[model samples]
Target chain A: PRVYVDVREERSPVPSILESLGVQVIPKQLPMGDYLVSDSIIVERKTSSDFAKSLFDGRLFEQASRLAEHYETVFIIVEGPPVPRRYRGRERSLYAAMAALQLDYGIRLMNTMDPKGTALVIESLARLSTREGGQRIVIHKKPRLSDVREWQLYILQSFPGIGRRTAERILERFGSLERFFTASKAEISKVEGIGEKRAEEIKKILMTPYK
Target chain B: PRVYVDVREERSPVPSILESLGVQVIPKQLPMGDYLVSDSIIVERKTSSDFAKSLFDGRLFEQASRLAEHYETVFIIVEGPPVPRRYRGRERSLYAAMAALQLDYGIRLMNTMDPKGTALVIESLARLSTRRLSDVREWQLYILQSFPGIGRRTAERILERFGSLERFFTASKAEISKVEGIGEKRAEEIKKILMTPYK
Candidate 1:
């Protein structure tokens, strides 16, 4: 399959790698996003240090927002440590920034161990359009969440650090909320992802008198 | 340090794990997040399949919105494959939902190998409360864009107008409103989110 390469990426070894992998490289000055894998799938490539610089100055968000407007599936493959070694602060900011880029702009963030890994992800994208259903590209409408499952999950989710999946597992295992609630600590702890400590937290809350 | 875990997790090996790790586990009816590490840090944990379900169901957004308002630093630790084995359709929906949670609510998202992996993230968090952009042209433009409602062109204009984040933050709302598309409404809003203090 043919992948459009941004002219700016000419010096980068990625396009060279793409050619060795037998991808037809078409050079174009795209308005935004670094590489166009298909009509629906566009990929952006950034090294760790470049990502830090773009993220800090707000260019990351701006470019991402524009790309999101034009493409249905946007994948940003990041190589290397996201935070520079010279710059050490709370790693929290870097984490938050990466989340926003993925969630806010509807971009897919991929982490590759190195450039070869990036080539593999790109190669898969080159094949994805041919094999996967195009219907997957549709920008989905708002989700429906105010259902009965949430209420049932809420009952189990209240346990210390218990999340949705655990709550659901409890429901599925014992067949009923009351069954799971009344089950012995041993029975409760046996559920998948649950260990002895989490089961105790549940038991303490269940039988202990109000403080 | 102490971690405030939600009451529903009682039977969950989760709270027991905290106690096992030597963390003082205080079970409480937390209003929003799952684990409260400190005053500023609160975490919401989810399994990958559940993350996909919540992402599509829209419950994740509501929960994250509430958490962000109450805690300065919000974290969501996800376990398992985000897209389940049976969830063979588009994984894009799940990704977009995750992105919205992070960008709109400022929630930090983490992926763990499995349920046991979650133990370290929470334990480390109980000890947390712990606490850049670079380049001259990139840095200057970066600073301005971080301001409320600021963009690339607007940042460049602001840099030419007053010259720095310090100058802009120091300028009166009137001074800020005068810059081209940024009106008095935006300037004040910028001040509200940017400079409002915790002390």
Candidate 2:
């Protein structure tokens, strides 16, 4: 993340303090992202009308270039928030992230355009932060199994109390019966992820179901 | 998530072990999903199935009543190792999870199926365990999160930092969640869990 600051101003405590926590602190002379530090800001010296950078990013590439000219210390964020979603070109997050950066650049664009024509993309970016993080953490469900029997066997080995012999013994003993986690450590050998080893081990620490 | 069986075997650990600390420990009889422990395991079961499950899930749903034969303890996990996919549904981990469970159930299924079939499943389950929990400690990733207080993100964080939940349980408060993004909200919650008095 890039930290922005006024080269002509006093000092800023944000980046200096963050640097103490083992985060790499780089001061830029441009306005790339929302992150702001102190001391220096860079000017990419380009605008959205340009075609070179535009081709690199497509439609928004021009907008991004223009937005970069707006801020003081533009932070081209190297790392984003935690649990970030993969930008595979299909998802909305990719555009959203770019939009946020463009907003920063847009702030500078405001100075160039007539005050009435100014489009403040920053507000939209603020809203982006909240919803963007949410999309990043979204998880998907599981896939299908090729062989049910193969899957079951794999799960049994994870049992703390049950082993191969005991696992087989328990399965033979019960008719397709699985161990019930009715109570903490309730022993059962018929569970995947709870083979004889875990089954044996579970005897000591099982709990009842969450009713 | 550390189980001191030596102590638990003597008697059920205080029900408030996790609760008192502010962490919720739902019993296996309960369903899966994010939750907090009030007094008992919350029964909000979730369906975290995989893509292939889409195919068998319909068949499985037809047999849903059959699955209901075993309530809370019966976990219908996907079978296989987790492959790198945009969605976990496509990952083999779901399959691996189910496979492991199948092995556990195999011991009982042995009575119904031919010995060879039973052996095939049983051996596979054990092998699956070795593969999944190859790190042995990695087993705790899913196990620890089974508790009411642990969520997927928190569970993954614990696994990444401590290599397992057992280590996370023993570590200091500062150590449990050191990564960024957790912020104050999640950390304080974990703190409340740590503060609770375990029997």
Candidate 3:
């Protein structure tokens, strides 16, 4: 399997490691995901700190959702130790989000101490194609969603503090994402699940640059 | 059948038109494509500016690929006229991309002057779905590239080397890596992917 290495990671050790291993390394600019190891497997490399920051900003969840939709196997490789302690003590929440990503979003997570170990694990996992595997690796293509509501719900839930229930309530009250985004704080607070504080929180995130 | 309205376009007149037609309306915040008219049909609504921007950014290709993968019928509804002076000299490339989207990607393109016209075309297309339609050809090369690392060039090489997708999947890593442009590492990765189980 040829791997499409992200041009951004060319400065890293990944290109050399894969090339030395006799992997056909193709450098290309990708909109998202770091390495495309096969027709269906996408490897996204992240440092521990970067992973935690992505989680906090809601970008991780958004990217994960997109990867899940497109690929059969999505692997997020975290390098270095667990996120450093300087992240506003949201380390606990980050772990929780990681767990949710694995359990709820169907993303596979692996931790490595360094780039060498990360490369080794990637090679080993890539070798799984030859293994007489279990039922877990078989991708049963999902039926395309027929209702726009499903897509709506998926997008709304990607907000920083939103969940499925709140997403639905907000959509129902505002009637659309555009309307919801443009709604005044008072109008947003009128939604049953969104109180004054949560509305303010949502507004602040929307009104400012996200990192 | 239910018509899914994109939440971003909720303020537009399209949703009301859909509702007035007695079609079930389900509002959604979609990442791409506008309406899921049926189990196998997706309608992508593009205003003149939206079409021009999508064409320029290569987003049209991505959206077309996803819709084609998931649905049997894909419709791109363009509101307003083809982009005018704002595109400057690149209008031909926009036209070229639109043509490729339809010809190469198998999308059906329709032109409408306004949102109201778009709604009408959508309803008519929805009604047309009940008719017995001809089958579409399965483009194997297209399916092959849908995988992560397989681009047009690689997909062609694999097909030429292996003869068929089934054969390609069944080939050993050594055999695959021996093919031009494929190396041992890619072969191993492919092997692992084929061996792994999916949800």
Q: For model 1, what is the error of residue B146's alpha carbon versus the real structure, in angstroms, after optimal superposition?
A: 25
Q: RMSD (Cα, Å) of candidate 1?
A: 25.9
| Per-residue accuracy of model 1 over A1-211 as CA lDDT, tens digit each | 7788899988787787778776788889987777888666788998767877887898888888887887877777776544557445634456556655544566766644356556655766665555555444332232233434554464355456577788777777876454565678899899987789878766554443210
lDDT of 3 at B103: 39
Q: Write the per-residue lDDT of candidate 2 for residues A124-155, one digit (tens) a residue.
A: 22233333223223233333333454456555
State the iRMSD of every prediction, in order shown. Answer: 25.3, 10.7, 31.3
lDDT of 2 by residue, B1-199 (tens): 2111122212333323323443333343323221212222111112233324543455434333233333322333222323324455545654553454355332111121222332233333333333433445335544555543454566676677777465666776576556443445556666667678988
TM-scores across all candidates?
0.39, 0.19, 0.35
Regions of model 1 farther than 4 Å from truth: A1-211, B130-199
Q: Ranking by TM-score, best first?
A: 1, 3, 2
Off by over 4 Å in 2: A1-211, B1-132, B135-138, B147-150
Ranking of models by lDDT: 1, 3, 2
For model 3, residues A148-202, the per-residue Cα lDDT tens digits are 4654554455454577888778876766555676677899888777788877766
Residue B16 of model 2, lDDT score: 37
Query: Under CAPRI classification, how is model 2 graded?
Result: incorrect
The 10-residue segment of model 1 chain A with minimum total lDDT is A136-145
Residue B148 of candidate 3: its Cα lDDT? Answer: 36
Query: Residue A175, candidate 2: how far off, in angstroms?
Result: 16
Residue B153 C-alpha lDDT in model 1: 87
